[PDB]
Design a protein around this motif. Sequence first.
Motif, mmCIF file in Angstrom:
data_model
loop_
_atom_site.group_PDB
_atom_site.id
_atom_site.type_symbol
_atom_site.label_atom_id
_atom_site.label_comp_id
_atom_site.label_asym_id
_atom_site.label_seq_id
_atom_site.Cartn_x
_atom_site.Cartn_y
_atom_site.Cartn_z
ATOM 1 N N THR A 99 0.876 -1.199 0.000
ATOM 2 C CA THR A 99 0.000 0.000 0.000
ATOM 3 C C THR A 99 0.933 1.276 0.000
ATOM 4 O O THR A 99 1.927 1.331 0.719
ATOM 5 C CB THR A 99 -0.889 0.034 1.292
ATOM 6 O OG1 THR A 99 -1.754 -1.106 1.267
ATOM 7 C CG2 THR A 99 -1.850 1.269 1.248
ATOM 8 N N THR A 102 -1.658 7.682 -0.334
ATOM 9 C CA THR A 102 -2.208 8.472 -1.474
ATOM 10 C C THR A 102 -3.132 9.535 -0.897
ATOM 11 O O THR A 102 -3.279 9.638 0.317
ATOM 12 C CB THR A 102 -3.044 7.597 -2.423
ATOM 13 O OG1 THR A 102 -4.165 7.100 -1.686
ATOM 14 C CG2 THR A 102 -2.285 6.345 -2.866
ATOM 15 N N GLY B 58 -2.159 9.748 2.824
ATOM 16 C CA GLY B 58 -2.225 8.957 4.083
ATOM 17 C C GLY B 58 -0.828 8.407 4.371
ATOM 18 O O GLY B 58 0.053 8.497 3.521
ATOM 19 N N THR B 59 -0.674 7.861 5.552
ATOM 20 C CA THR B 59 0.606 7.270 6.013
ATOM 21 C C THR B 59 0.431 5.760 5.784
ATOM 22 O O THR B 59 -0.492 5.204 6.358
ATOM 23 C CB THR B 59 0.800 7.516 7.499
ATOM 24 O OG1 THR B 59 0.953 8.921 7.662
ATOM 25 C CG2 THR B 59 2.104 6.894 8.052
ATOM 26 N N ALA B 60 1.286 5.167 4.993
ATOM 27 C CA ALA B 60 1.197 3.714 4.712
ATOM 28 C C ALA B 60 1.718 2.958 5.951
ATOM 29 O O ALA B 60 2.685 3.375 6.591
ATOM 30 C CB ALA B 60 2.089 3.320 3.527
ATOM 31 N N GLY B 82 -2.410 -0.980 4.732
ATOM 32 C CA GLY B 82 -3.344 0.153 4.447
ATOM 33 C C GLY B 82 -2.663 1.485 4.767
ATOM 34 O O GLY B 82 -1.445 1.598 4.746
ATOM 35 N N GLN B 83 -3.491 2.449 5.034
ATOM 36 C CA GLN B 83 -2.935 3.780 5.369
ATOM 37 C C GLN B 83 -3.820 4.491 6.384
ATOM 38 O O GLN B 83 -5.022 4.294 6.469
ATOM 39 C CB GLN B 83 -2.787 4.608 4.053
ATOM 40 C CG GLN B 83 -4.054 4.789 3.270
ATOM 41 C CD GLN B 83 -3.666 5.551 1.968
ATOM 42 O OE1 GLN B 83 -2.909 6.508 1.997
ATOM 43 N NE2 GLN B 83 -4.148 5.182 0.821
ATOM 44 N N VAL B 85 -5.183 8.047 7.794
ATOM 45 C CA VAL B 85 -5.612 9.370 7.295
ATOM 46 C C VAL B 85 -6.012 9.981 8.669
ATOM 47 O O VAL B 85 -6.784 9.403 9.415
ATOM 48 C CB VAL B 85 -6.764 9.088 6.312
ATOM 49 C CG1 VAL B 85 -7.371 10.391 5.825
ATOM 50 C CG2 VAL B 85 -6.192 8.327 5.086
ATOM 51 N N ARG B 91 -9.009 7.778 10.103
ATOM 52 C CA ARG B 91 -9.379 6.368 9.897
ATOM 53 C C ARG B 91 -8.174 5.657 9.323
ATOM 54 O O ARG B 91 -7.213 6.284 8.891
ATOM 55 C CB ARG B 91 -10.595 6.299 8.953
ATOM 56 C CG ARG B 91 -10.248 6.820 7.575
ATOM 57 C CD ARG B 91 -11.531 7.353 6.923
ATOM 58 N NE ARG B 91 -11.144 7.799 5.542
ATOM 59 C CZ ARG B 91 -11.195 9.052 5.157
ATOM 60 N NH1 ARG B 91 -11.453 10.022 5.996
ATOM 61 N NH2 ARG B 91 -10.977 9.299 3.895
ATOM 62 N N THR B 94 -7.870 -0.426 5.356
ATOM 63 C CA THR B 94 -6.975 -1.581 5.070
ATOM 64 C C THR B 94 -7.625 -2.684 4.237
ATOM 65 O O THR B 94 -8.835 -2.722 4.067
ATOM 66 C CB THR B 94 -6.505 -2.297 6.424
ATOM 67 O OG1 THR B 94 -7.699 -2.794 7.057
ATOM 68 C CG2 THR B 94 -5.899 -1.365 7.478
#
Lengths: 121, 121, 121, 121
Positions: A99, A102, B58-60, B82-83, B85, B91, B94
């Motif tokens: 992932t 983004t 977002g942060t992976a 996932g990431q 946000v 949230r 994932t």
Amino acid sequence: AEAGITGTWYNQLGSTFIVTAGADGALTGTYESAVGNAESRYVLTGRYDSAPATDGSGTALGWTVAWKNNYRNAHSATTWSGQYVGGAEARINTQWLLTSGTTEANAWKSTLVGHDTFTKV
Amino acid sequence: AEAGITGTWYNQLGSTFIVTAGADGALTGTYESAVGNAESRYVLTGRYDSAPATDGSGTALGWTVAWKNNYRNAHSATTWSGQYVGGAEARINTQWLLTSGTTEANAWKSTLVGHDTFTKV
Amino acid sequence: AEAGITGTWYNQLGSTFIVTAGADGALTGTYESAVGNAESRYVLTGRYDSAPATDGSGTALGWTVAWKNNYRNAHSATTWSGQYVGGAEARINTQWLLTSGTTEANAWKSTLVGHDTFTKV
Amino acid sequence: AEAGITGTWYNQLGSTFIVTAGADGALTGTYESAVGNAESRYVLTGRYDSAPATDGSGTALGWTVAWKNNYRNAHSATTWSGQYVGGAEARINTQWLLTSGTTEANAWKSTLVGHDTFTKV
């Protein structure tokens, strides 16, 4: 498992990972890749589910690598889910999810899926 | 990220996970599930890729849970990729892979795939 | 299923698909997207597994869309795998795989995975 | 692609599929499996994205098989997403999603993911 998992593993694309399977389900080590926005060694951490088995099944395990180290920050992370099968030709068969961080608009295209098989040779 | 990731997260099925995002990319904590061959709290370990961002991405991150504790040994492990946000309604979106240890003949059907969204509420 | 599947479905991102579920397991129709290197309507074809059910399960089905029409040729195709659940709030829950044609060197990063839920409203 | 895709393909587990790639992106044929709650030949339908390529990339395609025929009704369907690479050793590399119809409570565990490589030999 555990003792059998500990060691150096190689996959078809040239990546290598060295892991130590600790007594209580922990997996720690480093991953050195061969492809991607990667460059050098990255820390890996995971878990494995140790079981008494009497029917030759594999040991389920999984680990994560955040692709950031002192030379690269790819803003992404990959998780491998699979199982270890020991023996003459011990291997770890996995499927992975990569992932990338983004923006909300692009979140739908943030995850890639693939598979890798690692061997001791 | 990091400070914003640290805390308790809940998903749509009733599972909960408490994580601490450490300064150098580590994620450690416990996962208490709501479904599966799970029962209680399991250890979770993972990594997140911290970046200076200037465009709201977002942060992976990713983590693994081996489904074994003092009350259950499901012979399986799940990895979430996932990431995170952050914000008002922070949230973690994932996709996960759950692999069960199987015999070679059944390895083709050893992995399930799904997705989960965790919130702070 | 069948009669209940036939109709217009919408997903969270604004895409729409119109399908006809034929008596012998066929699914034919068009998909009009909302995101991607898409633009207009694309042909979709798939299959569904019709069963006598006595326990409220969903009907498994899947379809493919090659992203090429008279206005766009994205060199990619997406497949959706999931199940139809009918009733008041009938829905089709799916997971999809989007593969892009790549060179051998990039094949490892050719597939994206995601999920979509379609409703009649 | 098209002419090159048309024909009989075999995968590592012993399954076989015969396909006809029609001029306008259609893929039709039959799949005879080697594993699962399958038994005989099942109808397959899909699409491929035909492109003028000048850099050796693969042709993206996907197909679906509902596992129901006159001898078996497994209440499930599988979709394969991947690409065709032609040449001496032409192959179709894919990732698949197999969804089973379940009750709402079990929907979280309704989809399996895997990969298959098909060759002409």
